[PDB]
Design a protein around this nucleic acid. Structure first.
Ligand SMILES: [Mg+2]
Ligand SMILES: [Mg+2]
Ligand SMILES: [Mg+2]
Ligand SMILES: [Mg+2]
Ligand SMILES: [Mg+2]
Ligand SMILES: [Mg+2]
Ligand SMILES: [Mg+2]
Ligand SMILES: [Mg+2]
Ligand SMILES: [Mg+2]
Ligand SMILES: [Mg+2]
Ligand SMILES: [Mg+2]
Ligand SMILES: [Mg+2]
Ligand SMILES: [Mg+2]
Ligand SMILES: [Mg+2]
Ligand SMILES: [Mg+2]
Ligand SMILES: [Mg+2]
Ligand SMILES: [Mg+2]
Ligand SMILES: [Mg+2]
Ligand SMILES: [Mg+2]
Ligand SMILES: [Mg+2]
Ligand SMILES: [Mg+2]
Ligand SMILES: [Mg+2]
Ligand SMILES: [Mg+2]
Ligand SMILES: [Mg+2]
Ligand SMILES: [Mg+2]
Ligand SMILES: [Mg+2]
Ligand SMILES: [Mg+2]
Ligand SMILES: [Mg+2]
Ligand SMILES: [Mg+2]
Ligand SMILES: [Mg+2]
Ligand SMILES: [Mg+2]
Ligand SMILES: [Mg+2]
Ligand SMILES: [Mg+2]
Ligand SMILES: [Mg+2]
Ligand SMILES: [Mg+2]
Ligand SMILES: [Mg+2]
Ligand SMILES: [Mg+2]
Ligand SMILES: [Mg+2]
Ligand SMILES: [Mg+2]
Ligand SMILES: [Mg+2]
Ligand SMILES: [Mg+2]
Ligand SMILES: [Mg+2]
Ligand SMILES: [Mg+2]
Ligand SMILES: [Mg+2]
Ligand SMILES: [Mg+2]
Ligand SMILES: [Mg+2]
Ligand SMILES: [Mg+2]
Ligand SMILES: [Mg+2]
Ligand SMILES: [Mg+2]
Ligand SMILES: [Mg+2]
Ligand SMILES: [Mg+2]
Ligand SMILES: [Mg+2]
Ligand SMILES: [Mg+2]
Ligand SMILES: [Mg+2]
Ligand SMILES: [Mg+2]
Ligand SMILES: [Mg+2]
Ligand SMILES: [Mg+2]
Ligand SMILES: [Mg+2]
Ligand SMILES: [Mg+2]
Ligand SMILES: [Mg+2]
Ligand SMILES: [Mg+2]
Ligand SMILES: [Mg+2]
Ligand SMILES: [Mg+2]
Ligand SMILES: [Mg+2]
Ligand SMILES: [Mg+2]
Ligand SMILES: [Mg+2]
Ligand SMILES: [Mg+2]
Ligand SMILES: [Mg+2]
Ligand SMILES: [Mg+2]
Ligand SMILES: [Mg+2]
Ligand SMILES: [Mg+2]
Ligand SMILES: [Mg+2]
Ligand SMILES: [Mg+2]
Ligand SMILES: [Mg+2]
Ligand SMILES: [Mg+2]
Ligand SMILES: [Mg+2]
Ligand SMILES: [Mg+2]
Ligand SMILES: [Mg+2]
Ligand SMILES: [Mg+2]
Ligand SMILES: [Mg+2]
Ligand SMILES: [Mg+2]
Ligand SMILES: [Mg+2]
Ligand SMILES: [Mg+2]
Ligand SMILES: [Mg+2]
Ligand SMILES: [Mg+2]
Ligand SMILES: [Mg+2]
Ligand SMILES: [Mg+2]
Ligand SMILES: [Mg+2]
Ligand SMILES: [Mg+2]
Ligand SMILES: [Mg+2]
Ligand SMILES: [Mg+2]
Ligand SMILES: [Mg+2]
Ligand SMILES: [Mg+2]
Ligand SMILES: [Mg+2]
Ligand SMILES: [Mg+2]
Ligand SMILES: [Mg+2]
Ligand SMILES: [Mg+2]
Ligand SMILES: [Mg+2]
Ligand SMILES: [Mg+2]
Ligand SMILES: [Mg+2]
Ligand SMILES: [Mg+2]
Ligand SMILES: [Mg+2]
Ligand SMILES: [Mg+2]
Ligand SMILES: [Mg+2]
Ligand SMILES: [Mg+2]
Ligand SMILES: [Mg+2]
Ligand SMILES: [Mg+2]
Ligand SMILES: [Mg+2]
Ligand SMILES: [Mg+2]
Ligand SMILES: [Mg+2]
Ligand SMILES: [Mg+2]
Ligand SMILES: [Mg+2]
Ligand SMILES: [Mg+2]
Ligand SMILES: [Mg+2]
Ligand SMILES: [Mg+2]
Ligand SMILES: [Mg+2]
Ligand SMILES: [Mg+2]
Ligand SMILES: [Mg+2]
Ligand SMILES: [Mg+2]
Ligand SMILES: [Mg+2]
Ligand SMILES: [Mg+2]
Ligand SMILES: [Mg+2]
Ligand SMILES: [Mg+2]
Ligand SMILES: [Mg+2]
Ligand SMILES: [Mg+2]
Ligand SMILES: [Mg+2]
Ligand SMILES: [Mg+2]
Ligand SMILES: [Mg+2]
Lengths: 46, 275
RNA sequence: AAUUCCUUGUCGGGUAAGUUCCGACCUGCACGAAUGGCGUAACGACUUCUCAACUGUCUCAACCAUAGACUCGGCGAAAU
RNA sequence: GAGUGAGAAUGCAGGCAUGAGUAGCGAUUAGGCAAGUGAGAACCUUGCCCGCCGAAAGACCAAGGGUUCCUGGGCCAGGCCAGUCCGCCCAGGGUGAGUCGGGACCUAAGGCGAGGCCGACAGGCGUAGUCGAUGGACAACGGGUUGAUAUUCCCGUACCCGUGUAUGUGCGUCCAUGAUGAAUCAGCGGUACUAACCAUCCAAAACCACCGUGACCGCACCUUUCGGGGUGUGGCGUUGGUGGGGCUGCAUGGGACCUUCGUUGGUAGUAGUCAAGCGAUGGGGUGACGCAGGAAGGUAGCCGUACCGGUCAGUGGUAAUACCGGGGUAAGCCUGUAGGGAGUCAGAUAGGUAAAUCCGUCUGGCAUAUAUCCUGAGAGGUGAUGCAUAGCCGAGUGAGGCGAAUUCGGUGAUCCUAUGCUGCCGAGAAAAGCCUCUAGCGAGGACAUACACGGCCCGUACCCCAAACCAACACAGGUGGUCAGGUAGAGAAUACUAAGGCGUACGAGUGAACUAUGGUUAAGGAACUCGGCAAAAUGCCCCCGUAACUUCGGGAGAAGGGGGACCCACAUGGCGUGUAAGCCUUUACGGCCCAAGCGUGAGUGGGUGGCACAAACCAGUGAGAAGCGACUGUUUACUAAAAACACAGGUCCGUGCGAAGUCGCAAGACGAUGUAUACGGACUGACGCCUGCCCGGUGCUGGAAGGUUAAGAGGACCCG
RNA sequence: UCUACCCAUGGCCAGGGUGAAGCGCGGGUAAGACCGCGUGGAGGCCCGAACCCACUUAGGUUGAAGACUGAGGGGAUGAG
RNA sequence: CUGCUGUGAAUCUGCCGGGACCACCCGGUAAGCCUGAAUACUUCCCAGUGACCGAUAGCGGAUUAGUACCGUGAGGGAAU
């Protein structure tokens, strides 16, 4: 009777895996942020 | 000693445990214990490098003086002989008469109240630690150094020892517990006598769970792999590997020591293989 | 024989009737000694054979209730 | 000059048909009536019933959600129907902290990481550090109040950090007072790191003798006389191997010439130092840790009761004799019980980065102390002339006012003492905090009293086993923690119930076939079928009694047989508890014993009722063989749970140590704070008896006289 | 953020059986062995809820659900 | 012409090039450095033009447009 779906929300973990600071510390993340800014997203990152 | 378990369960049928008979205390010394955690067999990349390592009871480190070099001429009566999770041998808490406590590997037949002394003028009562220069050629020694100052590295597992065959110039020719004869700088420091707890290799661990308490995980073998996981995997039904035996990464059985090692000038004879 | 094609091999047991089963025989198509061989108490939601008890599994089906089906009002799809 | 012509691309978009007014309208609880509201009511409001949950379908949270909460209004969309209602729409309102949960405190796994090392660059790791709770430290409880918050507001009583002021004891810098340990002059005795010196381990360059040649030959010489070859001694000569000699040469340890450390006649406790207080970022102790298993002492809770307040429930009896309801109250501050733990005093002493009077260590004197200290459930007091409560009232929309008794027991924890105690091996975080010592800072400072103050930032509404989170839905699925009434009962199972909460969102009918889910079934009893699939059956407690086989543990609840209800008596019995009465003593928060009071099985004999006495619900079918795997375990999320994997045991191979192996370009890491009784790899797979032959092939390991072979050295000879 | 394995730090596991070593007593033994009795509380022990699984079957199979439900089923102090 | 490695001279009757190489002729003067113009492009601003589209077209976007929404996330992405 297992019915556990894949998405389990957690605000802190979502921040520490997808957040602004983690996107910035690396190089591909800064690329992603610049790309999203150029596209026009109102939300660059989690 | 060894005490056997009554077959009250299928998991105790042939098992046995140690008689912790030399264990005089059941609690370590507080000021000589460091935090120790488990690594899972995983290195600085987080990846498994040695397989079959995990679970296992929590243990803490006891600080052993493998480098018994600063207490020369200062006696130390044995305080306690106690357990250690990180060795096969027990450990002995030494009470140096200057007022300082240390841990050593307990030799065979070491008792409480035994005076242990260090230095070139130390006697050859088991337990005493002194340079290879000063032990007569023919003593049975344990916990010997490889380089003069590096601390004990050789013959420190439980029940083993090294026979000092002789001395030539500034080298001492002495045989490993493996049967190999090696030559070590005569300025190295050694401890006299065999290692205790010699019976610990006679004990049946009984059940898979008991060996899992030790930090050991199940070993799957290649013949039941798939050819993508092991060179031995594949085939329909049981196979012998269909191939000369190899490691998971393809390497064949054979000598594996690095040729032309700098220490290869210090090995008189290598070890025997099966006669 | 988790292995035997030939094969439902042969003999006994078991059934009223035995191609499975059990005990043996050896003509081992094409067992065999750590890809272990032969036994083995305990264990098994394992595979197989049997007895007792028990029964709608069956001879052979009947009846009762509830949810649907069915009728009335409301909303109201679908693959094709 | 063309984006120039569609009917097909299981073509793309939009609008609309066919099925069709058809299926469905989302569990296993279930609704009814009276009244109200309103245009309209099965569904909304109110009352009275009935039913369901009740280890939840109740109460409170975390995560997640985000305004869904309250009030007023609404009824177009949403709600699987309607809707006056709504978790839906609209507007306004609502979340109050020194003590709760976090930060301002501390660290773990880990993350990042000044310099750093590594790497063509991009980058990889990482030191010091600094973050990082799921853990450690740290001060508040009961009642009341709003439509909506409540250890937050208020009331009552507390506790914890700072701060200022006034007063009190009162050590002190100065005086002065003690304690004080010295040194120099010079007389000295060893203790000295310092030659030269001695013993020890090893061989500097080295001979002798026994025994052989790595190849040549002179050989005892042998074999078809000599084909090949070769057992064996010798010289040229050593792959040379072995046992001998002391000076000798190196290093290791030792006293001693050398210095220094201690001793004193007089001058000179002169001069200096300690004796208030704060004291580390340094030293140390603690913090500080597992699992299982009781027993004992408690309290909560529950069940009765003295006492209190009341009822008459339109029935045959029942007026107090019966029935119903009360039979309450925290932290804190006192006291220090049951339990549990603990020697004390002095001297010397680098071992603790320096110093320690602290800690370790070694010595010594005392009595095992009902002493003393620490801790510690609970009882008791106080908190509390307060607060709350069964009720009672005028008197209604209900705001309000008054308010009795509260005593003894039984039972009893999964909660507390308890971070205890006892066993066991698998041998069980860190840091701050706190305490302590000196380094140091120091002329003031310590404890107390009274008054007046400062106590920061973030969350707090509401849901939270759910129509408010994860599931596209108001979805039969999923979701961590706390609390745990009664009666049967071993029980947190099951049946029924209390408090509390629901009746959850299509209905009303109707004896069709058929499907699903339950029930019963004459006679037979596996005749069914691939197969006893599915159902049926056994099922509990107590006595009696149990096989082959066995590894001596088991098999075993083997198998099998008898009893079980209610009343009475034995019985004012026995047992637990325990008041009085009494006994005993360190005299008390004592122990012993026990009438009473309460609670409570077991049998024994007699009787009684029924078809039936473990009456419902709950709750093993058993026996005999064979194959495989020994065993408990693991596995193809979503057709395979198995004999397959694992396993404890066995062997083989590798590895002498930043090992081997593995991750990396490297540095580096794991292996392992391990060291051959260890670690990695391969096969086998508890146990018992054993494991034959083949080394030709292919690998592995080892060896070298030859054959063959790269780059590199060579450049004769030839050509321009 | 599902899942596989590991690392740190926490929590949970109703109720009831069995009765290991160890200790103590006695018997027996030149002395043992051993037995009977007790205390004792072991175990990848047993029965069995919470919890975790997923063996059988029936239903579902334009579902209530893109893997569920009902009735039984295995583990349940541990490789949980 | 040029990179890594090894070897490694001459200062002008030198040294380099002229498609292996040599001789002769010719051209030049390496191992030092600066350098405008003519050439490439358009985030942005101004002004224009089109035998360009005209709301399923033209930008994904004439309107909430990188919006709503879908995804853990990179990202995908409307209709009016
Ligand atoms: Mg599942
Ligand atoms: Mg990383
Ligand atoms: Mg291994
Ligand atoms: Mg050990
Ligand atoms: Mg062993
Ligand atoms: Mg075993
Ligand atoms: Mg193995
Ligand atoms: Mg294996
Ligand atoms: Mg493979
Ligand atoms: Mg391969
Ligand atoms: Mg295979
Ligand atoms: Mg095969
Ligand atoms: Mg057969
Ligand atoms: Mg065969
Ligand atoms: Mg046949
Ligand atoms: Mg026959
Ligand atoms: Mg047979
Ligand atoms: Mg094999
Ligand atoms: Mg075979
Ligand atoms: Mg074989
Ligand atoms: Mg086998
Ligand atoms: Mg067999
Ligand atoms: Mg068997
Ligand atoms: Mg199993
Ligand atoms: Mg199966
Ligand atoms: Mg008929
Ligand atoms: Mg119906
Ligand atoms: Mg209709
Ligand atoms: Mg066209
Ligand atoms: Mg058309
Ligand atoms: Mg078309
Ligand atoms: Mg269409
Ligand atoms: Mg139509
Ligand atoms: Mg039709
Ligand atoms: Mg129809
Ligand atoms: Mg219908
Ligand atoms: Mg419904
Ligand atoms: Mg009405
Ligand atoms: Mg009920
Ligand atoms: Mg209940
Ligand atoms: Mg609730
Ligand atoms: Mg509301
Ligand atoms: Mg409406
Ligand atoms: Mg509607
Ligand atoms: Mg309203
Ligand atoms: Mg509302
Ligand atoms: Mg405050
Ligand atoms: Mg760190
Ligand atoms: Mg840097
Ligand atoms: Mg790093
Ligand atoms: Mg922090
Ligand atoms: Mg926390
Ligand atoms: Mg509220
Ligand atoms: Mg309150
Ligand atoms: Mg510790
Ligand atoms: Mg315990
Ligand atoms: Mg008790
Ligand atoms: Mg009457
Ligand atoms: Mg009463
Ligand atoms: Mg001391
Ligand atoms: Mg009290
Ligand atoms: Mg919030
Ligand atoms: Mg609140
Ligand atoms: Mg609240
Ligand atoms: Mg919450
Ligand atoms: Mg609903
Ligand atoms: Mg929703
Ligand atoms: Mg739900
Ligand atoms: Mg759960
Ligand atoms: Mg109950
Ligand atoms: Mg229940
Ligand atoms: Mg009620
Ligand atoms: Mg009909
Ligand atoms: Mg039926
Ligand atoms: Mg019948
Ligand atoms: Mg009958
Ligand atoms: Mg039968
Ligand atoms: Mg038949
Ligand atoms: Mg039959
Ligand atoms: Mg038939
Ligand atoms: Mg069945
Ligand atoms: Mg049944
Ligand atoms: Mg029996
Ligand atoms: Mg049997
Ligand atoms: Mg029985
Ligand atoms: Mg009394
Ligand atoms: Mg008296
Ligand atoms: Mg008395
Ligand atoms: Mg009768
Ligand atoms: Mg049962
Ligand atoms: Mg057989
Ligand atoms: Mg087997
Ligand atoms: Mg098995
Ligand atoms: Mg499957
Ligand atoms: Mg299974
Ligand atoms: Mg299955
Ligand atoms: Mg398998
Ligand atoms: Mg092994
Ligand atoms: Mg092998
Ligand atoms: Mg290596
Ligand atoms: Mg080996
Ligand atoms: Mg096998
Ligand atoms: Mg074997
Ligand atoms: Mg063999
Ligand atoms: Mg062979
Ligand atoms: Mg061979
Ligand atoms: Mg060979
Ligand atoms: Mg060979
Ligand atoms: Mg070779
Ligand atoms: Mg060359
Ligand atoms: Mg016992
Ligand atoms: Mg015993
Ligand atoms: Mg068990
Ligand atoms: Mg079982
Ligand atoms: Mg069970
Ligand atoms: Mg069961
Ligand atoms: Mg179960
Ligand atoms: Mg699974
Ligand atoms: Mg099955
Ligand atoms: Mg259907
Ligand atoms: Mg349905
Ligand atoms: Mg099922
Ligand atoms: Mg089920
Ligand atoms: Mg330039
Ligand atoms: Mg457009
Ligand atoms: Mg138009
Ligand atoms: Mg578009
Ligand atoms: Mg999103």
């Amino acid at each position: 009777a297992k019915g556990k779906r894949t998405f389990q929300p957690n605000n802190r973990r979502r921040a520490r895996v997808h957040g602004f600071r983690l996107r910035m510390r690396t190089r591909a993340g800064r690329a992603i942020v610049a790309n999203r800014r150029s596209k026009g997203r109102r939300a660059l990152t989690a | 000693g060894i005490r056997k378990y009554k077959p009250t369960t299928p998991g105790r049928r042939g098992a046995s445990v140690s008689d912790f008979a030399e264990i005089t205390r059941s609690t370590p010394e507080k000021s000589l214990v460091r935090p120790l955690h488990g690594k899972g067999g995983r290195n600085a990349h987080g990846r498994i490098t040695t397989r079959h390592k995990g679970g296992g009871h929590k243990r803490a480190y006891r600080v052993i003086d493998f480098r018994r070099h600063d207490k020369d001429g200062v006696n130390a009566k044995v305080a306690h002989i106690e357990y250690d999770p990180n060795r096969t041998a027990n450990i002995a808490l030494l009470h140096y008469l200057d007022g300082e406590k240390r841990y050593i590997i307990a030799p065979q037949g070491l008792k409480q109240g035994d005076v242990i002394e260090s230095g070139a003028n130390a006697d050859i009562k088991p337990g005493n630690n002194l340079p290879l220069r000063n032990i007569p050629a023919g003593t049975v020694i344990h916990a010997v150094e490889l380089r003069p100052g590096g601390g004990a590295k050789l013959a420190r597992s439980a029940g083993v020892s090294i026979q000092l065959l002789g001395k030539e110039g500034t080298y001492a020719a002495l045989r490993m517990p493996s049967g190999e004869i090696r030559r070590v700088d005569v300025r190295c420091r050694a401890t006299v006598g065999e290692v205790g707890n010699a019976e610990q290799s006679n004990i049946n661990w009984g059940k898979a769970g008991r060996m899992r308490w030790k930090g050991k995980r199940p070993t799957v073998r290649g013949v039941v792999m798939n050819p993508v996981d092991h060179p031995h995997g594949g085939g329909e039904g049981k196979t012998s590997g269909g191939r000369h035996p190899v490691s998971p990464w393809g390497k064949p059985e054979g000598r594996t020591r690095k040729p032309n090692k700098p220490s290869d000038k210090l090995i008189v004879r290598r070890r025997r293989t099966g006669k």
